[PDB]
Amino acid sequence: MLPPDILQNGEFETIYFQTNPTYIKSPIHIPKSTIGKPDTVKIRHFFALLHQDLVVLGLEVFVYLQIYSDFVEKYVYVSKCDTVGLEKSTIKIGKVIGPVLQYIINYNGYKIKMKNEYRTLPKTQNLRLCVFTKPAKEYLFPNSAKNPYKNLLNGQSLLRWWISIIDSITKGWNNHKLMIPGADKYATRKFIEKYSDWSEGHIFKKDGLAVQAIPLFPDDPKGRFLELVIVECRYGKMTVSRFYQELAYRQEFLLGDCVSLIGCCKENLEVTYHDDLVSTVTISEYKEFMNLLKLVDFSDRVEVSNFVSNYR
């Protein structure tokens, strides 16, 4: 998952675990009218880099497997990524985030139970990588924002960073899409002028109803608007085009700092299923860890060190 020059034989350590794969309802509305509906399996990934007793950075990624008879639609959603900044930064953060996210994208050793011993997945996979960029001060690590070595990127800097990282791990993919809701075509294109494989737009179905095209990801700015569409039961009127038009005027975007949406796709990848023993936990155990994490003062070495030792 990480090369030797970053871990340095134990100078740095990793926290990495997955939830046990769990069947959920589709994050994209599928009319019960549809023929050959897929089963959806969700896996949460949590990663953190440790330097001796202290957390350096963290990354949370959710993987959704839409399992059809002959292929899988695989959505990889970056939930959260954050740094602590208690120590002067030794590794460039993208040299860690890039390889970890690439490992998670390509991981195919999930132990999936039968839908009511282990299910075998189709070999043909269509990949979708979904990332939003929004310069929040503390995605994962409370009160880290006033740590002395936390480098807080503004919105445009954060977007340039993510484009660089995502381009590096999606070489040869079929499309790379960028949208900055509320920005003109000219402003959006400047971010991808040096990226020949990137274009303006999004990766989802372009026509029809928005809730049948756009996935509802947790704690996603796009998903927050979709949630409103559904709670007001406008799911039968809202088109894809009008959804992205009105997304630009939401407070989170119009008052935000270069809030952007990235999507990348690779079609018809032949994969081989490949056991790779990693720590797996129940969803309750996963949530317990994340709830403990929210109660840590990441400006306080004592509390951070205590959190790490308790995990060990």
The CA distance from 127 to 64, in Å, is 10
The CA distance from 184 to 176, in Å, is 18
- Per DSSP (E only), the strands in 208-283 are 260-270, 280-281
- The structure tokens listed for 235 are 């799911």
Residue type, 306: N
Instruction: Provide DSSP, 211-242.
Output: GGTS---TT-HHHHHHHHHHHTT-TTT-BHHH
Residue type, 260: S
Nearest Cα residue to 42 out of 25, 56, 17: 25
Phi and psi angles of residue 230, each rounded to the nearest 5 degrees, phi first: -75, -40
Phi and psi angles of residue 45, each rounded to the nearest 5 degrees, phi first: -115, 130
Instruction: Return the biggest CA–CA distance within the chain.
Output: 57
Binding residues for acetyl-CoA: 132, 136, 151-153, 161
The CA distance from 16 to 203, in Å, is 29
Q: Which experimental technique did the depositors report for determining this structure? A: X-ray
Task: State in Å, rounded, how far the first CA of the chain is from the last one.
Answer: 20
Nearest Cα residue to 202 out of 213, 212, 217, 191: 213
Of these residues, 5, 53, 219, 220, which one is catalytic? 220
Binding residues: 132, 136, 151-153, 161
Our answer to whether residue 220 is catalytic in this structure is yes
User: Measured at the alpha carbon of residue 221, what is the angle toward residues 164 and 68, in degrees to the nearest 5?
Assistant: 80
The CA distance from 59 to 15, in Å, is 10
The CA distance from 58 to 99, in Å, is 13
| CA dihedral over 109, 114, 119, 122, signed as positive or negative | negative
Nearest Cα residue to 299 out of 151, 152, 141: 141
Nearest Cα residue to 134 out of 259, 262, 263, 261: 259
The CA distance from 267 to 71, in Å, is 10
The answer to whether 269 and 127 are in contact (CB under 8 A) is yes
SS3 79: strand
- The structure tokens listed for 234 are 């406008």
Phi and psi angles of residue 16, each rounded to the nearest 5 degrees, phi first: -150, 125
